[PDB]
Ligand SMILES: CS[C@@H](Cn1nnc2cc(C#Cc3ccc(Cn4ccnc4CO)cc3)ccc21)N(O)C=O
């Protein structure tokens with residue numbers, strides 16, 4: 001059987017919210033079978049619980065925000081990507097503030113935190129959502145699509161408005177084996193252009209941002225002293241974001257995602273459209289892991 005997974009132990013991290021600039025304490029707690037990823041705001045009385053599900057998304061401007069009443073959890077995409085990548089089904093994420101800490105701007109520190117706490121396989125079949133039919137959404141020149149594929153694959157194209165490393169676009173495609181996410185995606189940091197960042201800062205946004213958690217591109221040159229972790233780090237980061245948004249389906253996907261200048265807003269539109277189109281998907285489990293189209297690393 002491909003089994004559900006949780007953490008073996010509680011683990012803690014601290015960081016700053018990139019948007020809010022607030023110091024936040026993060027606790028990952030093990031959870032039992034069929035819990036899913038549940039976020040909680042520990043700083044509120046009573047404590048408020050928000051399942052990490054498409055129906056709980058309230059804002060998608062520059063990050064995915066979960067909302068329940070007037071209670072928000074901002075920037076869930078990078079932590080959710082790490083959980084998707086490692087195959088964590090069940091976890092409580094307890095936050096002392098309205099934003100997940102940015103860490104280094106990738107999923108790398110979250111996958112390390114999770115793999116340090118250890119993975120616990122549970123005595124229940126892991127649930128997958130299979131893409132049975134193509135589903136697509138467009139808005140102007142932007143496109144996001146689910147395509148049937150016996151496995152998990154994510155393609156992305158981004159269009160910069162000017163030349164960066166002497167071209168206007170980057171494309172990447174990752175056909176996932178057990179090991180692809182940690183090695184080729186997890187370390188891809190978020191990025192901003194200096195002129196955009198200057199504008200975001202003027203409007204009192206990106207208050208936690210720095211070279212320590214973001215690639216800063218001034219014109220066509222990277223300002224970060226040590227440069228890039230991958231040649232195509234920027235498009236690999238959009239693949240990271242997309243895997244985090246896809247996990248709001250609450251079950252691991254069997255199929256292909258393609259993004260063309262997509263972002264959190266259109267990614268979330270795709271998810272809502274797929275969820276509505278019940279003939280395009282079906283929940284499945286694998287009692288024989290050897291015949292399953294997706295493998296996870298050993299726990
Ligand atoms: C959760 S992140 C999101 C994409 N996203 N959205 N907003 C963002 C803001 C930034 C930033 C930044 C920043 C970097 C350095 C500095 C210091 N500074 C300024 C000028 N000169 C200096 C050097 O002294 C100031 C701000 C990066 C990515 C962003 N994402 O990936 C969603 O998925």
Ligand SMILES: [Zn+2]
Pocket residue numbers: 077078190237241
């Ligand atoms: Zn991101």
